[PDB]
Curated annotation (Swiss-Prot), chain A:
The keyword Cytoplasm does not apply. One of its GO terms (biological process) is spermatogenesis. Belongs to the U2 small nuclear ribonucleoprotein A family. It is found in: Nucleus. This is Probable U2 small nuclear ribonucleoprotein A'. GO terms for cellular component: catalytic step 2 spliceosome; precatalytic spliceosome; small nuclear ribonucleoprotein complex; U2 snRNP. Involved in pre-mRNA splicing as component of the spliceosome. Associated with sn-RNP U2, where it contributes to the binding of stem loop IV of U2 snRNA. In the germ line, has a role in oogenesis, by regulating spermatogenesis and nurse cell nuclei chromatin decondensation and dispersal, probably by regulating the splicing of proteins necessary for germline differentiation such as the meiotic protein mei-P26. Its main location: nucleus. GO terms for molecular function: U2 snRNA binding. It comes from the Eukaryota. It comes from Drosophila melanogaster. LRR repeats lie at residues 20-41, 43-64, 65-86, 89-110.
UniProtKB/Swiss-Prot annotation, chain B:
The lineage of its organism: Eukaryota, Metazoa, Ecdysozoa, Arthropoda, Hexapoda. Belongs to the spliceosome where it is associated with snRNP U1. Interacts with the SMN complex. The chain holds residues 4 to 95 of 216 of the full protein. It is found in: Nucleus. Binds stem loop II of U1 snRNA. It is the first snRNP to interact with pre-mRNA. This interaction is required for the subsequent binding of U2 snRNP and the U4/U6/U5 tri-snRNP. Plays a role in regulating sex-lethal splicing. This is U1 small nuclear ribonucleoprotein A. The gene is snf. Belongs to the RRM U1 A/B'' family. Residues 4-83 form the RRM domain.
Amino acid sequence: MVKLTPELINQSMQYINPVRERELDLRGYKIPQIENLGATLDQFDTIDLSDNDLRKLDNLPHLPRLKTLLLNNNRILRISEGLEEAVPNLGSIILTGNNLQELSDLEPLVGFTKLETISLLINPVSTKPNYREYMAYKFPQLRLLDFRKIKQKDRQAAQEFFRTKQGKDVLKEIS
Amino acid sequence: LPNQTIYINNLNEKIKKEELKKSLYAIFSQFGQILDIVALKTLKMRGQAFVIFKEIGSASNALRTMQGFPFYDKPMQIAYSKSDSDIVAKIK
C-alpha cells in the first residue's frame, strides 16, 4: 500500500485516454485517503482512483479542469458536502463497487450543476426502493444512471409521482 | 483463446458513437486499464464495439461479469475477439 503523495503522482501514468482526455492513473495502490491532489496542478480531465482503499470521497482541492472521477472498487461509504466548490465541472462520477447504503447518502452530490452521468452499480443504494425515480427527481440534470438513460417520460413520471401525497410520504421517509 | 480484446454485439445503434465510447469506457473501467475502444458508425460495425484491455485477465473478468448487462436498455452480447486480423477486417 502507498499513500497519495506528490511522488506517486509524478511517477504515475499521465496520458491522453481513449476518449481523448488527459488522465492520471492512480489505480491499484490501496490508497486510503484522498490527499495531495493539488500537486496535479489541474492538469487532468480525468483522475482514475479505481482499486484503492478509500472510505470517503472528500478533500478535493480546486480543480476546474476535472470532468470525470473514476472510483471503481473502493470502500466508499460517505461523500463530503460542498465538493462542487472544488470540482464544479464534474460531469461523470463512477462509483461502481462501493459501499454507499441509503438514498440520503447521495445528497452531497445534488450541488453539482453539470453532473450528467452517475454509476452506483454494486452499491447497496442502487437496489433500494424508488431508486431510479428518486434520482430523476433529486438530480434533474442527470442523463445517465447506471448506464440506462433517464428518459423524458421518466423525468415527467418522477415529477408527477413526487407531487402526489403518496409520493411526498415516500420522500419524507427517504430522509 | 482468451485475449486482451472483448467484442460486444447488440449495442444500441441510436446512441451517438462519441457518447457510446465514453459510456463503454466508464462501465468497463472497473475491470482494468483500457488501451482503446473501437465503435464506428459503419454497417460492418453496426451495433458492435471492441474494448481493448491492457491485460488478458481484465478482459476475462469483463466478459464474465458484464455478459447480458442492459446497457442503454439492450443486453450486451460479449465474446473474446476472434483474432487481431478479424478486428482489422472489421474496421476496414
